């Protein structure tokens, strides 16, 4: 629920990823017969449907600012993960509370007989 900064958003998203599900041949599983080190990349295009790309840039800037402090607080050198921790708190925010129906949690389905 955020809006763009004075900067100018380019609505296009042209991106690359390392994901590649499966393998073309069984030997491609093997690094010895694997693609050149740059061959892992794949690419695609997205458009600013519903303002999503531009929204993403603003969100990213805010996240970057928040992240900068967190990184200052880290003691580990290369911070390989964070999302895993976030997944843990996703669960913790939903669990360990009392929860039959009365509490505002656990998405309990309506009760049948």
């Amino acid at each position: 629920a955020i809006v763009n900064a004075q900067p100018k958003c380019n609505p296009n998203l042209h991106y690359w990823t390392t994901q590649d599900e499966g393998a073309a041949i069984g030997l491609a599983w093997i690094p010895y017969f694997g693609p050149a080190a740059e061959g892992i990349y794949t690419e695609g295009l997205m458009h600013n449907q519903d303002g999503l790309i531009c929204g993403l840039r603003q969100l990213a800037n805010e996240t970057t600012q928040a992240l900068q402090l967190f990184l200052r607080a880290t003691t580990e050198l290369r911070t390989f993960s964070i999302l895993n921790r976030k997944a843990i708190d996703f669960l913790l925010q939903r669990w360990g509370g009392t929860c039959h129906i009365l509490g505002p949690d656990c998405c309990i389905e309506p009760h049948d007989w």
């Epitope: 900064a5 380019n10 458009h47 600013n48 303002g51 603003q58």
Partner: antibody, heavy 120, light 107 residues
Framework: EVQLQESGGGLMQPGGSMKLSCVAS????????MNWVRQSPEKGLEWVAE??????????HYAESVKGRFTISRDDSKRSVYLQMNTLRAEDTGIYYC????????????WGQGTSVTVS | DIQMTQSPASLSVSVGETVSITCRAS??????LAWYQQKQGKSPQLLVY???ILADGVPSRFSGSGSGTQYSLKINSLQSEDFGTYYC?????????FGGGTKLEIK
């Protein structure tokens, strides 16, 4: 739905000054910046000015052909906007509009009914 | 500042006709470009969000294309409700620029 309305229009003598204005509701001002545009049968639509959100410290811009002939203002508690014309010189007879929109689109997605402002 | 033009300055049309509009400009790396239309006695209304994403409540008939100096508007078929004039604009950042527009003439 933006509830926008416009005020302060109509004929005025040349060499004057006026604060053209707008008011709106149902779209909080905290999430946007606004533009003034103008149109004439002789010109088509043209941009007039930009009013930034306070996060940009209310920075503003004006078309260079009108810059310094107008200033802008806004009030985010009143949800109101002012064109604050510095002058009422000539050729200002085009229809005026004030616009706003989603920052992840552009301000074109909301507009007024427009108003007529003219010069003698 | 980026300059822009449109053509044909008007197009004569018939109902259900497929149409398109050319809009050209000083180069724009941004796909920020967008289109809108107005009717006499009516405030302009957006037709498409920047690049090709359609404005909400716009009919599926609407389409468009391109980037940089060349881009276009397309409509698969026409309804009498679409009479008006049409425009395009540079929203790449500031100052905003607008096309002279076109007129949807009827046959």
């Amino acid at each position: 739905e933006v509830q926008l309305q416009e005020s302060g229009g109509g004929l005025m003598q040349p060499g004057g000054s006026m604060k053209l204005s707008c008011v709106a509701s149902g779209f909080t001002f905290s999430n946007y910046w606004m533009n003034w545009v103008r149109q004439s049968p002789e010109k088509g639509l043209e941009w007039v000015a930009e009013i930034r959100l306070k996060s940009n410290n209310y920075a503003t811009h004006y078309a260079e052909s009108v810059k310094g002939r107008f200033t802008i203002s806004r009030d985010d508690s009143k949800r109101s906007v002012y064109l604050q014309m510095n002058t009422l010189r000539a050729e200002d007879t085009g229809i005026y509009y004030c616009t706003r929109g989603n920052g992840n689109y552009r301000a074109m997605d909301y507009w007024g009914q427009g108003t007529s402002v003219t010069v003698s | 500042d980026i300059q822009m033009t449109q053509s044909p300055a008007s197009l004569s049309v018939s109902v259900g006709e497929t149409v398109s509009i050319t809009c050209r400009a000083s180069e724009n790396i941004y796909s920020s470009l967008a289109w809108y239309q107005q009717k006499q006695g009516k405030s302009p209304q957006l037709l498409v969000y920047s690049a090709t994403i359609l404005a909400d409540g716009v009919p599926s008939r609407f389409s468009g294309s391109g980037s940089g100096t060349q881009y276009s508007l397309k409509i698969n078929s026409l309804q009498s409700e679409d009479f008006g004039t049409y425009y395009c604009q540079h929203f790449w950042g500031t100052p905003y620029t607008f096309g002279g527009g076109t007129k949807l003439e009827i046959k």
